[PDB]
């Protein structure tokens, strides 16, 4: 980026961080694999 | 030493006392699908001996005016034995093939057959813009016949067909041809009923001839699938 | 100066290009970032959330009635209850789902799908169903004896209200694709069918017709490629008020 | 067996041979192997340090050329009373329409490559000057939704890639990556791309890059013009597998390998090579 | 900014140029590579495979009959059987071969060629032939006494069915070239002729007319330069269906 | 290559590896020079 | 991207520019170099070779007669035999020589010249001549007493057949130049004259008229600058066959 | 030179090697300064 303002830069396509659980498993108590979910 | 050979797979074996070494297509050998190339995630079935064995198809007669014969794989075997059953019950299949073409005659007979394994042999139709139909392509165990072997029925040429894995059966020299074929495709597995990886072509470049007692001279094809794997189990089609 | 020459492509405007460009407001200081709940960084995170399949997409079924499949106490055995076409790239029960909508912004896909069904009958209602996934090749099975030969899960109604049928990625090619031909060898996924394993059985005071709600989602072995405009939205005229933005 | 070759092999001097049991000039074509007789074994040779390079025959270079794959001319005008490409057209991408490129690609069974696309535009008045029009080329995936009018809202191209260019600018250019759903494109496909039996033979949709929709962005002018758009494709980062017999019969269709042959040799169905009087007749014999 | 100036050539589109260009689909992830049998990296690999020469390119010979040369039991001695023109850059028996077809995509060539002949008569048939390569300069030899003075191999029919005649690279210049003049000093390769060394001899029950199949290939000392469009393919009209790609 | 996607790069004309034998000698048993091919 | 701006000169095509340009044939492998006799790297090497001056450029002298100066036995003393104009940049005896021809592709020159004369009379012929170089300023000397005051060499005929008169670089300015004005102070080199020092003397049976061949060349202290089109070649029409190159 | 083929490069004006004697004195026996050339 030859411009003085950083917002002028090209795209930033390097953020590979993810956390699907905030959408797929937003339950307070984690669900164990194989174990009956309701006990 | 390189003229005699025994091939043994499953409960089947074949010997020849007049071979000409044998061909390993592109210098490769069949193998099972490795984990780093796999796509389908279900555990595959590897029947081994029930499918990896020699299947002998009906013979054809070599006549003075023959144009040549062809058999597409796996189509030719899709309805034979346990290989055929696995193919019908599974959406996906994968395998190599051991091909052995047989033709014997007499020290007084002459003739030369080009035995070539063609990958993706997409046929063309003659003198029409209409593409070949399903029945023009899928002949099954009976195989088909060449209309214009001179251009390999695809507008190219048999003269340059030697660029493909092949051997010859020149009657004064040998009585059999053997070609080992590895899985050949752009995908690790495929649906066996709509795509043929290889086409076995047997074409008489030098016609059968003799001045001795005339006899029926057959050409026989035996094919053994190798390292068979099947995925996507369901009901039979 | 520096000797240079312009290459083909010079001066063009490619909508997918990636370059820096002149800042309109120099020395502008953007508002400080603040933590906000629910940040999403990859669309694959969104499609892993299961959403309702519109299985009852039939004439006579209106609105939410289309989002549930009613099953009744049967008089005959091994009865077929319903089936579901599987091309998440074509219109059908799977199109208006999170995985379906986002996938339709792409052309190629790969990965396992998961269908979860929740039984919504009364507590006193019992039953066993069999959910089957049939890889492609033939006609959709119409009898349990045939469907049962494919991938399946036998579901017993009970305290745990839902069952999951995994539709494992079973394809010859790395990816499947959309090309508007549902019968193409690179598109057809196969079928999902549901039959009574036993029967829905309920007492006199429980409703004898119960509903199931089917959900679908992608697993984390999913991948989407080749972005394209979605076929699910379009316009033939200016929206109301659009022209007023110029007045 | 695999090795790095940068120049043609050298020749080593050879002496007289008279050894029993050694017959390098004899071979057995039946094995399928090509003769391994070396020049040194057939005749007496001298030593030659061969410096001839082999880079021009590298597959990357052999196929690495921008070849014409599409040429389309249409009328740019007020199409009020047109039955016809009304200021735009759609082209299902394929590499089977122009024979020079087609024959070369068909020398291989499978090919993996990225494709550099170059678009050249030309205009002619149907005289008072040539307008510097702006064109839009939108990439629409195979079988996907294409525009039906020059001013369709489909051209808003929210996700599809679009390139806008002027006739006065150098030809537009961009690279389409190797986008096949498989590890390589199938130049030939011995199968049917559908689960039923009525599908098309030899056409694997997985090998169709997609649709190219091109329109003139400018509204029509008071007069009509003929606009021609030429698209060139250059494969790069190439990997090739299983070479094949070269095409000899003229092509008949872009959808198949159907053949008929020329009316008379050369390249006629019953005679690829032109005839000579006899097998002992030497053409172009030095008199 | 940086002071610059455009050079002649700026803005042109050279079909053989080599530059990077804008990616149409950013962040696209190509399908993983998979090992596939038969990879070819240099076209020279292809021309080293021998293919059939169309030696019997005569009127009356149809299709595959053109790919074999028939020899019969002779009544006279030292008989000439056939000859073969050698310009792999012009139409003739060598044009539709792997080496011929690929070489015709180029203009310059250098290297040794090899011709292999396979005798396809019966086992009981015997014979000796002499295959001769005559470097350029004069008229094609018509008698064995003359042909025999050039490069040659005397072939004895037997268990090993094939013989190889090497056509060594013998040229004044590093490369030979095509210029459509077969008699040019930079094009003419010379001649190949075949005579009976003794005679084809067979018993009563063997066919008394036998065929030979001739093959040709380049050796690994071969080199090709200056790519050009091949003269072996052309079109004067749109192919069927080409225009339909626009509908 | 100033583009972010590697497939955008210029041509790669540096692969001089070769193995003609996969086409010229795909026989299981290597053929020795001078020795009769059929024995 | 990089901010830039085009400078005056941008887009122009200067025939003497020096830049790299797009290779038409990528990966082309030029023919290997081979040692060849007579390589020349600087044109100054060529002009150091002496070549024949056309001193007898007179009407009546045809062809090679113009390349030799005939001298006869004189009846009078101190006789003037011939003179030579010295502007190697104008038409005259020095123009069609190696140094003259190459120098005329330039505008400025500096360095010493050397004139060598070979006596071609019979062995029995004797004589002494005086060759004089007169720096510029006045009229060409017509008497030996005047010429003798300049740079000179007295030549005695004998076994060594040739004599060399050095025309040393004597100039006020570093270089002399051509401007089509032979009398310009920056062009005129002066004069060369030849007189009998004694006389040509021969016996009755020897020819009494003998020839001299004069040669000229530059020494290695020579320098040429400012290239220009040569005035020694030109065309007003297409050469025969030029237009046929388009047919 | 940013092109991949070396023949595309700009001119090479740095070869100052010379050997005029191959043209000016191609005689087998070198001629000594001052000494009679013919002896
Ligand atoms: C008259 C005579 O003595 N003998 C002819 C013999 O010349 C003729 O041969 C044809 O001759 C022409 C020259 O006129 C060409 O050399 C033909 O060859 C090719 C070529 O190399 O150019 C081969 C190529 O494959 C062909 N291409 C296509 C795309 O079809 C071209 C093409 O037809 C021509 O360029 C036409 O424009 O020709 C060569 O065969 C034979 C014919 O039987 O007949 C003798 O009598």
The Cα–Cα gap between D257 and B155 comes to: 6
* Both structure tokens of C76: 């005959």
CA distances from H10 to D230, D258, G7, H6, H13 (A): 33, 50, 21, 9, 9
The Cα–Cα gap between C94 and C87 comes to: 7
Burial class for E60, CB neighbours closer than 10 Å (0-12, 13-18, 19+)? exposed
- Which residues fall within 8 angstroms of residue C116, CB to CB, at 6 or more apart? C50, C162, C163, C164, C165, C214, C215, C216, C217
CATH number at residue D162: 2.60.120.20
Nearest-5° Cα angle at C56, C55 to C58: 130
**Element containing residue B96 per DSSP (H, E):** strand B90-102
Q: What is the DSSP string of D9-31?
A: PPB--------TT--TTEE-GGG
**Element containing residue G51 per DSSP (H, E):** strand G51-52
The Cα–Cα gap between G68 and G39 comes to: 31
Peptide bond before D48: cis, by omega within 30 degrees of 0?
A: no
Asked if G94 and G215 count as a contact pair (C-beta separation under 8 A), the reply is no
- Which residues fall within 8 angstroms of residue C133, CB to CB, at 6 or more apart? C150, C151, C152, C165, C166, C167, C168, C190, C191, C192
The Cα–Cα gap between C190 and C92 comes to: 14
Asked if B154 and E142 count as a contact pair (C-beta separation under 8 A), the reply is no
**Using the beta-carbon criterion (under 8 Å), do C8 and D145 form an inter-chain contact?**
no
Q: Do chains A and D touch (3 or more CB pairs under 8 A)?
A: no
Q: Closest Cα to atom 25, ligand 1: which residue? A: E232
- Which residues fall within 8 angstroms of residue G19, CB to CB, at 6 or more apart? C3, E7, H10
HEC profile of chain C = CEEECCCCCCCCEECCCCCCCCCCCCCCCCCCCCCCCCCCCCHHHHHCCCEECCCCCCCCCCHHHHHCEEEECCCCCCCEEEEEECCCCCCCCCCCCHHHHHHCCCCEEECCEEEEEEECCCCCCECEEEEEEECCCCCCCCCHHHHCCCEEEEEECCCCCEEEEEECCCCCCCCEECCCCCCECCCCCCEEEEEECCCCECCCCCCCEEEEEEEEEECCCCEEECCCCCCCCCCCCCCCCCHHHHC
Nearest-5° Cα angle at D97, D96 to D101: 65
The Cα–Cα gap between E120 and D177 comes to: 50
Find chain E residues with C-beta within 8 A of G27's C-beta: none
**Element containing residue G100 per DSSP (H, E):** helix G98-103
* Both structure tokens of C64: 């939410």
The Cα–Cα gap between D68 and D78 comes to: 29
| Half-sphere exposure of residue C229: CA atoms within 13 angstroms, side-chain side | 22
Phi, psi of C37 (to 5 degrees): -65, 150
The Cα–Cα gap between G26 and E14 comes to: 11
Asked if D157 and D187 count as a contact pair (C-beta separation under 8 A), the reply is no
The Cα–Cα gap between C232 and C217 comes to: 19
What's the domain range around B228? Answer: 1-237
Q: What is the DSSP string of G167-215?
A: E----SSS-EE-SS-TT-TTT---EEEEEESS--B--TTS-SEEEEEEE
Going by C-alpha positions, the residue among C182, E36, C139, C172 that lies closest to residue B195 is: C172
CA distances from B38 to B41, B48, B187, D78, D286 (A): 8, 19, 9, 56, 62
Residue for token digits 């149409």?
Answer: E24
Interface of G with A in 3-62 (CB under 8 A): 3
Burial class for B127, CB neighbours closer than 10 Å (0-12, 13-18, 19+)? exposed
The Cα–Cα gap between E64 and E56 comes to: 9
Q: How far is E4 from chain G (nearest CA, A)?
A: 5
| Residue G63 DSSP one-character state | G
- Which residues fall within 8 angstroms of residue E131, CB to CB, at 6 or more apart? E115, E117, E152, E153, E155, E163, E165, E192, E193, E194
Atom of ligand 1 nearest to the CA of D267: 30
Task: State whether residue E246 is helix, strand or coil.
Answer: helix
Burial class for D155, CB neighbours closer than 10 Å (0-12, 13-18, 19+)? middle
Displacement of CA D202 from its chain's centroid (Å): 17
Displacement of CA G108 from its chain's centroid (Å): 14
| Half-sphere exposure of residue D134: CA atoms within 13 angstroms, side-chain side | 10
Asked if D256 and D202 count as a contact pair (C-beta separation under 8 A), the reply is yes
Asked if B93 and B189 count as a contact pair (C-beta separation under 8 A), the reply is yes
Task: State whether residue D207 is helix, strand or coil.
Answer: helix
CATH number at residue B187: 2.60.120.20
CA-derived radius of gyration, chain A: 20
HEC profile of B140-209 = HHHCEECCCHHHCCCCCCCCCHHHCCEEEEECCCCCEEEEEECCCCCCCCECCCCECCEEEEEEEEEEEE
Q: How far is G218 from chain H (nearest CA, A)?
A: 11
Asked if D260 and B126 count as a contact pair (C-beta separation under 8 A), the reply is yes
Residue for token digits 């007789």?
Answer: D37
Domain ranges of chain A: 1-38
CA-derived radius of gyration, chain F: 20
Asked if E69 and E214 count as a contact pair (C-beta separation under 8 A), the reply is yes
Give me the sheet containing E223-225, strands edge to edge: E176-177, E108-110, E223-225
H helix runs in D87-149, sequence order: 99-105
Going by C-alpha positions, the residue among D171, D167, D65, D170 that lies closest to residue D118 is: D171
Measured between its terminal Cα atoms, the distance across chain F in Å is: 57
Resolution in Å, one decimal place = 2.2
* Both structure tokens of C111: 């990965």
Task: State whether residue G67 is helix, strand or coil.
Answer: helix
**Using the beta-carbon criterion (under 8 Å), do D1 and F21 form an inter-chain contact?**
yes
Nearest-5° Cα angle at C12, C7 to C14: 120
| Cβ of D266 less than 6 Å from ligand 1 | yes
Going by C-alpha positions, the residue among B158, D275, D280 that lies closest to residue E84 is: D280
Task: State whether residue G62 is helix, strand or coil.
Answer: coil
The dihedral of CA E172, E176, E178, E183: what is its sign?
positive
Residue ranges and CATH numbers for the domains of chain G are: 1-247 (2.60.120.20)
Helices (H) and strands (E) in chain D, counts: 3, 11
Phi, psi of G116 (to 5 degrees): -120, 130
**Element containing residue G71 per DSSP (H, E):** strand G69-72
Phi, psi of B77 (to 5 degrees): -110, 0
How many Cβ atoms sit within 10 Å of the Cβ of residue G7? 12
Task: State whether residue D56 is helix, strand or coil.
Answer: helix
For D58, the closest of G25, G27, G32 (CB atoms) is G27
Q: Closest Cα to atom 37, ligand 1: which residue? A: E231
Going by C-alpha positions, the residue among D287, E20, E34 that lies closest to residue C8 is: E20
How many Cβ atoms sit within 10 Å of the Cβ of residue D266? 17
Q: Closest Cα to atom 24, ligand 1: which residue? A: E232
How many Cβ atoms sit within 10 Å of the Cβ of residue G158? 13
CB contacts < 8 A (B, D): 159
* Both structure tokens of G18: 């020096």
Peptide bond before G235: cis, by omega within 30 degrees of 0?
A: no
| Residue B120 DSSP one-character state | T
The dihedral of CA D254, D259, D262, D266: what is its sign?
positive
CA distances from G26 to D55, E16, E103 (A): 9, 7, 17
Residue for token digits 């200016």?
Answer: C238
- Which residues fall within 8 angstroms of residue C175, CB to CB, at 6 or more apart? C108, C109, C110, C223, C225, D181, E31
Asked if G228 and G109 count as a contact pair (C-beta separation under 8 A), the reply is no
Asked if C176 and C186 count as a contact pair (C-beta separation under 8 A), the reply is yes
* Both structure tokens of G53: 């001056």
Question: Please, which chains are in contact with D (at least 3 CB pairs closer than 8 A)?
Answer: B, C, E, F, G
* Per-residue burial over D243-254, b = 16 or more CB atoms within 10 Å of its CB, e = otherwise: bbbbbbbbbbbb
Nearest-5° Cα angle at B151, B148 to B156: 150
Find chain D residues with C-beta within 8 A of E62's C-beta: 270-271
Asked if E119 and E157 count as a contact pair (C-beta separation under 8 A), the reply is yes
DSSP-derived pairing of the beta strands E128-134 and B69-73: unpaired
Displacement of CA E125 from its chain's centroid (Å): 29
Q: What is the DSSP string of H8-35?
A: GSPP--------THHHH---SSPPPSSS
Helices (H) and strands (E) in chain E, counts: 3, 14
DSSP-derived pairing of the beta strands B176-181 and B23-24: parallel
- Gapped junctions in chain B, after residues (C–N > 2.5 Å): none
* Both structure tokens of E182: 């077969």
Q: Closest Cα to atom 16, ligand 1: which residue? A: E91
| Cβ of E91 less than 6 Å from ligand 1 | yes
- Nearest chain C residue to D156, by CA: C229
How many Cβ atoms sit within 10 Å of the Cβ of residue G174? 10
Measured between its terminal Cα atoms, the distance across chain E in Å is: 49
The Cα–Cα gap between E136 and D286 comes to: 9
Burial class for C133, CB neighbours closer than 10 Å (0-12, 13-18, 19+)? buried
Residue for token digits 């699938």?
Answer: B225
CA distances from E94 to E87, E97, E103, E115 (A): 7, 6, 11, 10
Asked if E155 and E128 count as a contact pair (C-beta separation under 8 A), the reply is yes
Mutate to test the pocket of ligand 1, among D246, D252, D274 (most ligand atoms within 8 A of CB): D274
Asked if E115 and E215 count as a contact pair (C-beta separation under 8 A), the reply is yes
The Cα–Cα gap between G134 and E181 comes to: 62
How many Cβ atoms sit within 10 Å of the Cβ of residue E40? 25
How many Cβ atoms sit within 10 Å of the Cβ of residue E187? 18
Task: State whether residue B221 is helix, strand or coil.
Answer: strand
CA distances from D169 to C13, C243, E105 (A): 11, 33, 33
Phi, psi of E37 (to 5 degrees): -65, 150
Residue for token digits 């030179």?
Answer: H1
| Residue D193 DSSP one-character state | S
* Both structure tokens of E155: 């072939």
* Both structure tokens of D10: 């050298």
The Cα–Cα gap between G34 and C93 comes to: 77
The Cα–Cα gap between E19 and E17 comes to: 7
CA-derived radius of gyration, chain E: 24
| Residue F18 DSSP one-character state | E
The dihedral of CA D191, D193, D195, D199: what is its sign?
negative
Asked if G54 and G81 count as a contact pair (C-beta separation under 8 A), the reply is no
DSSP-derived pairing of the beta strands G4-6 and E2-6: parallel
| Cβ of D274 less than 6 Å from ligand 1 | yes
């Amino acid at each position: 980026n030859f411009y003085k303002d950083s917002y002028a830069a090209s795209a930033s396509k390097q953020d590979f961080s993810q956390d699907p659980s905030k959408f797929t498993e937003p339950v307070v108590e984690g669900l164990k694999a194989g174990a009956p979910v309701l006990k | 030493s390189d003229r005699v050979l025994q091939l043994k797979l499953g409960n089947s074996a074949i010997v020849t006392q007049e071979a000409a070494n044998y061909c390993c297509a592109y210098g490769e050998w069949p193998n099972y699908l490795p984990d780093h190339e796999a796509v389908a995630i279900d555990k595959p079935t590897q029947p081994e001996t029930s499918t990896d064995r020699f299947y002998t198809l009906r013979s054809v007669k070599w006549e003075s005016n023959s144009t040549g014969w062809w058999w597409k794989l796996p189509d030719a075997l899709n309805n034979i034995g346990m290989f055929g059953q696995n193919v019908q019950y599974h959406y996906l299949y994968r395998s190599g093939f051991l091909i052995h073409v047989q033709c014997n005659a007499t020290k007084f007979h002459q003739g030369a057959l080009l035995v070539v394994a063609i990958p993706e042999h997409q046929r063309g139709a003659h003198d029409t813009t209409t593409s070949p139909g399903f029945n023009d392509i899928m002949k099954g165990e009976r195989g088909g016949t060449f209309n214009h072997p001179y251009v390999l029925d695809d507008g190219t040429s048999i003269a340059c067909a030697t660029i493909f894995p092949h051997q010859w059966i020149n009657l004064r020299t040998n009585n059999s041809a053997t070609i080992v074929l590895p899985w050949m495709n752009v995908a690790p597995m495929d649906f066996p009923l709509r795509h043929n990886q290889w086409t076995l072509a047997v074409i008489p470049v030098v016609p059968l001839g003799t001045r001795t007692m005339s006899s029926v001279v057959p050409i026989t094809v035996s094919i053994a699938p190798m390292c068979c794997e099947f995925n996507g189990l369901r009901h039979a089609i | 100066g520096v000797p240079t020459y312009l290459l083909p492509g010079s001066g063009q405007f490619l909508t997918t290009d990636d370059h820096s460009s002149a800042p309109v407001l120099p020395c502008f200081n953007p508002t400080p970032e603040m933590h906000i709940p629910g940040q999403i960084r990859n669309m694959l995170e969104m499609i892993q959330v299961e959403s309702m399949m519109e299985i009852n997409n039939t004439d006579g079924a209106n609105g939410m009635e289309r989002l549930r499949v009613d099953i009744s106490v049967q008089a005959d055995l091994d009865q077929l209850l319903f089936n579901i076409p599987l091309d998440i790239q074509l219109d059908g029960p799977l199109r208006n789902t999170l995985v379906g909508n986002i996938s339709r912004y792409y052309t190629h896909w790969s990965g396992s799908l998961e269908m979860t069904f929740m039984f919504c009958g009364s507590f006193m209602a019992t039953g066993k169903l069999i959910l089957c996934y049939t890889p492609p090749g033939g006609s959709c099975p119409t009898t349990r004896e045939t469907a049962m030969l494919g991938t399946h899960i036998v579901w017993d109604f009970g305290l745990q209200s839902s069952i999951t049928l995994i539709i494992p990625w079973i394809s010859g090619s790395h990816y499947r694709m959309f090309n508007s031909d549902a019968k193409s060898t690179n598109a057809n996924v196969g079928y999902v069918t549901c039959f009574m394993q036993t029967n829905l059985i309920v007492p006199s005071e429980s409703s004898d017709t119960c509903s199931l709600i089917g959900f679908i989602a992608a697993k984390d072995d999913f991948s989407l490629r080749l972005m394209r405009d979605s076929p699910d939205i379009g316009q033939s005229n200016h929206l109301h008020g659009a022209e007023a933005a110029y007045q | 067996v695999e090795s790095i070759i940068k120049t043609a092999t050298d020749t080593v001097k050879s002496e007289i041979n008279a050894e029993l049991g050694v017959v390098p000039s004899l071979n057995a074509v039946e094995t399928g192997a090509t003769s391994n007789t070396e020049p040194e074994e057939a005749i007496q040779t001298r030593t030659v340090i061969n410096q001839h390079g082999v880079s021009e025959t590298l597959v990357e270079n052999f196929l690495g050329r921008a070849a014409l794959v599409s040429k389309k001319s249409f009328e740019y005008k007020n199409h009020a009373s047109s039955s016809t490409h009304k200021n735009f057209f759609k082209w299902t991408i394929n590499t089977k329409s122009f024979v020079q490129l087609r024959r070369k690609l068909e020398l291989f069974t499978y090919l993996r490559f990225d494709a550099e696309i170059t678009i050249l535009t030309t205009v002619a008045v149907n005289y008072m000057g040539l307008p510097d029009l702006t064109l839009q080329a939108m990439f629409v995936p195979t079988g996907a939704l294409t525009p039906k009018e020059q001013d369709s809202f489909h051209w808003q191209s929210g996700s599809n890639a679009s390139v806008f260019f002027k006739i006065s600018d150098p030809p537009a250019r961009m690279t389409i990556p190797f986008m096949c759903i498989n590890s390589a494109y199938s130049v030939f496909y011995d199968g049917f791309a559908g689960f039923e039996k009525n599908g098309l033979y030899g056409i694997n949709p997985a090998d169709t890059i997609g649709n190219l929709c091109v329109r003139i962005v400018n509204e029509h002018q008071p007069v009509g013009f003929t606009v021609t758009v030429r698209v060139y494709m250059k494969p790069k980062h190439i990997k090739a597998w299983a070479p094949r017999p070269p095409r000899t019969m003229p092509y008949m269709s872009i959808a198949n390998a159907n053949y008929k042959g020329r009316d008379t040799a050369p390249n006629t169905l019953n005679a690829i090579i032109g005839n000579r009087a006899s097998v002992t007749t030497m053409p172009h014999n030095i008199v």
